[PDB]
């Protein structure tokens, strides 16, 4: 039983920019969420082998995690903030698909998502 290869965190043939929104997304949004007591399960790809979740990557075909997003930000992988926000959304959606309402992992995701939305409600001037 193996995990899949993780998502790419660089790609020279994908357009990219440094923008004020993307800088904020790393410096403020990601960095703040990272320090939350409920960040830890979302700080790396799901290790389905270690966690003994053999069906995880049968159900979840578009993995995404904050460790990946951090790397993407640091490497200027994104063209715009919206692309990074989409990744965060995929992370949350995955968690809500694989688990169920009331699970502890879902309480963790819901708290992170609430905080995320608060942080992103106001960004720097778009570019
Ligand atoms: C992300 C993600 N989505 O699902 C899971 C994770 C996850 C990642 C790393 C460590 C643990 C997990 C947890 C989990 C469960 C309880 C608590 Cl308190 C904390 C985390 N759950 C699995 C699914 C599972 N059913 O085990």
Strand and helix map with partners:
Blueprint: H1 20-35, H2 56-59, H3 66-74, H4 81-98, H5 104-120
Helix pairs in contact: 1-3, 1-5, 3-4, 4-5
Cpi-0610 is lined by residues 41-42, 46, 51, 53, 95, 98-99, 104-105.
Under CATH, the topology can be stated as: Histone Acetyltransferase, Chain A
Q: Structurally, how many domains make up the residues?
A: 1
Total helical segments: 5
CATH-assigned homologous superfamily = Bromodomain-like
Bound molecules: cpi-0610
Assembly type: monomer
Helix content: 40-55%
What is the strand content? under 5%
CATH class: Mainly Alpha
CATH architecture: Up-down Bundle
**Overall SS class:** mainly alpha
Alpha-carbon distance between the two ends:
44 Å
Instruction: Give a count of the beta strands, DSSP E runs of length 2 or more.
Output: 0
Q: Which value, in Å, is the CA radius of gyration?
A: 15 Å
Q: Mind summarizing the main beta sheet?
A: none
In one word, what is the shape? Answer: globular
Protein name: Bromodomain-containing protein 4
Domain Bromo: 17-123
Cross-link (Glycyl lysine isopeptide (Lys-Gly) (interchain with G-Cter in SUMO2)): 58
Site (Acetylated histone binding): 99
